């Protein structure tokens, strides 16, 4: 049973924009589906749900989007969509696809809890544009050896939207790794840091790539940090 | 339409400890509630549905009890990954609506962080932008603090600094902190250096080096 979201990025105020999810290992028609937003350091709130086949009027919406939202369902494909039209600067946030009661859950028609959540989705309201990212190597050095470790990583800067993913040798080293979160320079871009910890010994020896994805801007960047010659 | 009070909004625990969490509702929601851990970064989680009954797959430490207008969320034995901010969700009438969650944190013990410098990759210096970066890796408490200092000058206005959630392993910090200067500001001085206080050290540190070495 999974849940997968995509779609999102910038949206100028007052625009449009559709993010759906995509969901597998269920009967997609049998359960309701709801979505539900967070504001950047803030709670979930309810956004709205789209009912399981059983019913003629197929959505529920909260009275705060009500007037700009759509949810609607592929005709045959298992994906959830959300339409935000006219979007408003409170509406930026991470918007999550859930999935709720089956049509036999009798608590279903006046309200439900799910179980199974989306990565998420972030909706960034603004009127700036897509910029890609740079990808710096943070090369591991005497400066940056501690006893028996090392420590190198990754700079991504100058990029907008957000947000950034960051990922060691395609996700086979996740220890030590710490990525850090983004912060918006002057400029209105951001730049966020990976840097990893490993032991000295293996810098001759083992490879380094950070994967850097920025899918608003469609750029994948795959960097060799290396130690320095000197 | 139905309001959910939950308390605490923060909560500080050490590892074997038990930790509370209620949940308040306007009007009674019978046993229409459900509980959730949404670990930093990820997606939410679900603990407990039903008021009291555990999914399948979570540790039999978290237990929910309660009923109506008042449910709580106990954590018999805090783990150093049970670090999230948990919230409940009423599922009695539309619309559905959740509590204000309640951030859990360990408490360990105190732990220097390691510093280390990195100068600017001649690629970025290429481009005539130049950004040294500090780290401050794996320390506890979160309050810390980074001075930039070139020449023995120190720097305001051209730095930002990022601080990371607690691990899921050894409940520690990490912070990077990134000076940015011009090509030509940055070819203009000699000495770049970064002075960390932390209270896991008796005397500042403060690591530095020359510009290109």
């Known amino acids: 049973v999974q849940l997968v979201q995509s779609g999102g990025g910038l949206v100028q105020p007052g625009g449009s924009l559709r993010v759906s999810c995509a969901a597998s290992?269920?009967?997609?028609?049998?359960?309701?589906m709801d979505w539900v937003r967070q504001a950047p350091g803030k709670g979930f709130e309810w956004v709205g749900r789209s009912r399981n086949k059983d019913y003629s009027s197929t959505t529920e919406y909260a009275a705060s989007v009500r007037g700009r939202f759509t949810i609607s369902r592929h005709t045959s494909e298992d994906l959830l969509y959300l339409e935000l039209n006219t979007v408003k600067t409170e509406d930026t946030a991470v918007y999550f696809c859930a999935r709720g009661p089956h049509h036999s859950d009798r608590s279903g028609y006046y309200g439900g809890t799910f179980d199974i959540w989306g990565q998420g989705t972030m909706v960034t309201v603004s009127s700036a544009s897509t910029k890609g990212p740079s990808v710096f190597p943070l090369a591991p050095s005497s400066k940056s050896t501690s006893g028996g470790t090392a420590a190198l990583g990754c700079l991504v800067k100058d990029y907008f939207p957000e947000p950034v993913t960051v990922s060691w040798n395609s996700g086979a080293l996740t220890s030590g790794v710490h990525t850090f979160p983004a912060v918006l320079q002057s400029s209105g871009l951001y730049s966020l840091s990976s840097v990893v910890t490993v032991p000295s010994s293996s810098l001759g020896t083992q490879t380094y790539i950070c994967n850097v994805n920025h899918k608003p801007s469609n750029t994948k960047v795959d960097k060799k940090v290396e130690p320095k010659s000197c | 339409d139905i309001q959910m009070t939950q308390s605490p909004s923060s909560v500080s625990a050490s590892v074997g400890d038990r930790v509370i969490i209620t949940c308040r509702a306007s009007?009674?929601?019978?046993?229409?509630l459900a509980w959730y851990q949404q670990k930093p970064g990820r997606a939410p989680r679900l603990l407990i549905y039903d008021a009291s009954t555990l999914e399948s797959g979570v540790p039999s430490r978290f237990s929910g009890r309660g009923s109506g207008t008042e449910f709580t969320l106990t954590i018999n034995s805090l783990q150093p990954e049970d670090f999230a901010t948990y919230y409940c969700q009423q599922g009695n009438m539309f619309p559905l609506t959740f509590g204000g969650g309640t951030k859990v944190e360990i408490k360990r013990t105190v732990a220097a962080p390691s510093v280390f410098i990195f100068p600017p990759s001649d690629e970025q210096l290429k481009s005539g932008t130049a950004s040294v970066v500090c780290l401050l890796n794996n320390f506890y408490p979160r309050e810390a603090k980074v001075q930039w200092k070139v020449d023995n000058a120190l720097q305001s206005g051209n730095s930002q600094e990022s601080v990371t959630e607690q691990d899921s392993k050894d409940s520690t910090y990490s912070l990077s902190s990134t000076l940015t200067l011009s090509k030509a500001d940055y070819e203009k001085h000699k000495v770049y250096a970064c002075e960390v206080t932390h209270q896991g050290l008796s005397s500042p540190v403060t690591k530095s080096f020359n510009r290109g070495e």
């Open positions: 290992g269920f009967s997609f028609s049998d359960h309701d």
């Open positions: 009007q009674g929601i019978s046993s229409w």
